[PDB]
Every structure is written in C-alpha cells, then in structure tokens.
Amino acid sequence: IRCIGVSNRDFVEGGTWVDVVLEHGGCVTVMAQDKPTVDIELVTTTVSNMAEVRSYCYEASISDMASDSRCPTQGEAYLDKQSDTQYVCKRTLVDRGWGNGCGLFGKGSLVTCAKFACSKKMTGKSIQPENLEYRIMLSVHGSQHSGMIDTGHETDENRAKVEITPNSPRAEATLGGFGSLGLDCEPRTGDLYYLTMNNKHWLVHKEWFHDIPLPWHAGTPHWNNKEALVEFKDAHAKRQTVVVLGSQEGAVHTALAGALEAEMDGAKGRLSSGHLKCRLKMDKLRLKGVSYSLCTAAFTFTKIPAETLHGTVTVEVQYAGTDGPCKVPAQMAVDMQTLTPVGRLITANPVITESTENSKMMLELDPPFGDSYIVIGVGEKKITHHWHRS
C-alpha cells in the first residue's frame, strides 16, 4: 500500500518472474493473477566509504607580510620566509635609482611573502562501485485499515526491508502468510567525485575537479598553488602589496550549475537520483485466505472513496459481521440490475481478517472512465457509491 499517494507511480502486471524498474521518488505496484498485489520502492542509494582525494581552499586569509629588495647588480632579494611552506611569495623586478637608494639606475630584485591560511575549504571524495547500497521497501495490499496506513517492518508481515549491494544482488523477502518474494537486481544502470562545500554536495567529473584553479592539498596542511587565492599588486621599489582574492563559494556554486546534486546520511553519501532493474521471483508468493468464504453481513463506508492521481479509488469499509475471516465482495458496476463487473481491483483478494464485529479494512480499485458505482457487500444490504473518472 506504500505506492498509494505517490505521483511517479507505475503499475506492472504479470508466472514465475516479473521485471521491475525502480527509480528514486518512484514506486511500482505489481499485480499477478492468484498472487497478492505488492508495492515496491527504491527508498535510498548510499555510498559507504568515501576516501578524501583532494581539498581546495575557496576562502583564505593572509598575515605577516614582509619584503626584501636589492639594487641593480646586487643579485636576488631574499627572505627567510621564502622557505617556509606556509608562505606565498612573489619575486619581481623594480625600477631603482638614486631616488630610492641605489648607486645605479636599472632593475633591482624584489621579493614579497605573506603567511597563507585557509578559512574555508571544499573536499572531493572517491566513490568505489562496490560501496553502493540500495534499500528497497516492500508493502503488500494485505487489506490494512487506515490505522495500519515505515518502522516495524520486521514484526509486520505486510512490510519488508531489502538491502541490495553490487556484491549481493539477490535477496529473498519473507512476507509471513504471503510466503516470500525473491529479488535479483542489476545496479550497473544506476569518472565521478563526491564534492562537499559548506554542507552542499555534488557528483562532479574527475577532469573538472582536477582542473579547479584554487589552492589544494592531498588526502598542518600544505597548500599547493596558494597563488590562486592571492594577488600581488606592485606598489613601490622596496614594497609590493599583497591581498587575498576573497571567497570563491559563489563562483564555484555557479560553475556547478546543471551538475548532479547529492545529499548526506550521516558519514555516508546519498544518491538522490538512481535507477535499479530488478527481476522478481513470484513462485513463493501466495495469497492468504483462498479458503475464505464471501462475507455475508453488511458493510458501511468509514472513509469517503477518494481518487488517486492515477484515477484509482481507495475505499475504507467497516464490517458488522462475526463470520471473519472472510472475502470482501468488491467491484464496480455500470448497472445495478445486471451488476457485471466494470474496471478491476488493484487489491487482489480483499479480506475482513478478524472474527470480531465492526472491524475496518481498506481496498483500491481501478474504475472505468465516466460514471460507475463502487459496490461493497452482497444482497439487499450491499452499499453503493457513485463514482466518476475524468
């Protein structure tokens, strides 16, 4: 019943195997003759062990600015901080003469150094294909009431959590009295890096990531290409001004436009977009209560029939009888004399499971276009509801 309400909802009809395409945000209702209806959804795709590859500085700070200068023919300018790896330096040639303290007129050497510090960095992580995990949720059309309409699936036969990984593509899901469903999925269909910048994530190309013009370190940190976040403007003969370029967060963000965005789930990456092809084994799937007799007593609508986005109807009824467990007489009819079924049920084998009076139950129907009637129960006491589709 988990697909009921989902916009991107598909319907597959089957018989030993049914092929199903599971997409993120999507849900598949699977039907097969003499088998219960099952809702299947790819709920999350996660990657578990992302190793840091390279981080890039997008906001830097500079301090301890100093200079050294030489006169023409006096050789290269020298600062002791030009061997400190935390410093960024620029070596230039400046016009010198009697006006600024040289015996000769010509180009002298100038060196300017600044202590570079990163304020904010973005980290790129590796994705190993084996480290992908697909979580699939299963939910049978088991005649649940609205008070049964995600947690506690291990103790509820109608629900199951399946874990699919590239190494373990096959799984078997027990559904209590419904028997079991087998799943054999192909990940494959679902050059990249996992990028994080200020609690924002993306899946970026390898070539693009490596050619980012910002200071970087591999895997206290040593920044390679600090020159990218600084600017050395010539100011005087014995001094050169050095200034930080300012935060590149916005520029990087707009460069990432169109690129695939991702999310986090603790220390694990979550793929918002994914596709998974599964082959479902139907041999062990079984309808509960084929031995049940048709319910003989009166039904009453608890909830007003409501149309889903796909034009199907959800119906909730209450049952006055004590002859439970029994089959729910349910159909749609165009004429109330003949009562030949029109449309079809989505819920295979709708049942009142309890032997108690005034018990609730929910079912889903696929009405024909135009006017028809929802019909619950048998004989004189049968309840009717006018319906219109499109």
Ligand X SMILES: *[C@@H]1O[C@H](CO[C@@H]2O[C@@H](C)[C@@H](O)[C@@H](O)[C@@H]2O)[C@@H](O[C@@H]2O[C@H](CO)[C@@H](O[C@@H]3O[C@H](CO)[C@@H](O)[C@H](O[C@H]4O[C@H](CO)[C@@H](O)[C@H](O)[C@@H]4O)[C@@H]3O)[C@H](O)[C@H]2NC(C)=O)[C@H](O)[C@H]1NC(C)=O
Residue 263 Cβ, how far from a second copy at the closest point, in Å?
10
Residue reference for tokens 């910002």: 214
**In angstroms, what CA-CA distances link 145 with 166, 349, 350, 352?**
37, 15, 12, 10
Which CB, 148 or 333, lies closer to ligand X? 148
DSSP state of 304: E
Instruction: Give me the DSSP letters along 143-187.
Output: ---GGG-----SS-TTEEEEEEBTTB-EEEEE-GGGBEEEEEEE-
| Residue 388 sits in the site that holds a second copy (CB under 8 A) | no
In the block, tokens 């001094």 appear at: 239
Site membership for a second copy, residue 254 (CB under 8 A): yes
Distance, CA of 85 to CA of 119 (rounded, Å): 17
Whole-number Cα distances in Å, 272 to 41, 75, 99, 125, 264 = 14, 60, 66, 17, 10
Instruction: Evaluate whether 81 touches 151 at the Cβ level (below 8 Å).
Output: no
User: 82, 86, 100, 225: which one contacts a second copy (CB under 8 A)?
Assistant: 100
Q: Report, in Å, the least distance between residue 38 CB and Na ion.
A: 12
* DSSP notation for 260-283: EEEEEETTEEE-SS-EEEEEEE-T
What is the 3-state secondary structure of 13-31? ECCCEEEEEEECCCEEEEE
Half-sphere exposure (Cβ direction) of 285: Cα atoms closer than 13 Å: 29
379 is a contact residue toward ligand X (CB under 6 A): no
Comparison of 1 and 276: residue with beta carbon closer to ligand X: 1
Q: Which of 156, 186, 307, 323 binds ligand X (CB under 6 A)?
A: 156
**Per CB under 8 A, 246 contacts a second copy:** yes
Binding-residue pattern over the window 207 to 236 for a second copy, x denoting contact by CB under 8 A: ------------------------------
Asked if 147 is part of the footprint of ligand X (rule: CB under 6 A), the reply reads yes
Q: Is 46 in the site for a second copy (CB under 8 A)?
A: no
Q: Cα separation of 217 and 226, whole Å?
A: 10
Q: Is 273 in the site for a second copy (CB under 8 A)?
A: no
Q: Which stretch binds a second copy (CB under 8 A): 15-23, 75-83, 300-308, 345-353?
A: 300-308
Tell me the C-alpha distance between 195 and 262, whole Å.
9
Residue 163 phi/psi, 5° resolution? -110, 120
Q: How far is the CB of 237 from ligand X (least distance, A)?
A: 13
Scanning 28-36, 173-181, 299-307, 319-327 for contacts with a second copy by CB under 8 A, the matching segment is: 299-307
C-alpha–C-alpha distance, residues 328 and 349, integer Å: 8
Cβ closer to a second copy: 156 or 307? 307
340 lies in the binding site for ligand X (CB under 6 A): no
Return the residue of 33, 98, 152, 220 that touches a second copy, per CB under 8 A.
98
Q: Which stretch binds a second copy (CB under 8 A): 15-23, 105-113, 128-136, 218-226?
A: 105-113
CB of 100 to ligand X, least distance (A): 10
Q: Site for a second copy (CB under 8 A): which residue of 95, 172, 335, 357?
A: 95
Kindly state whether residue 59 participates in binding a second copy, applying the rule CB under 8 A.
yes
How many CA atoms are closer than 13 Å to the CA of 139, on its beta-carbon side? 20
Q: Which partner in a second copy, ligand X, Na ion, none is near 251 (CB below 5 to 8 A by kind)? A: a second copy
List residues binding ligand X (CB under 6 A). Answer: 144-145, 147-148, 151-152, 156
List residues binding a second copy (CB under 8 A). Answer: 4-7, 58-59, 95-100, 103-107, 146, 149, 198, 200, 243, 245-254, 303-304, 306-309, 314, 316, 362
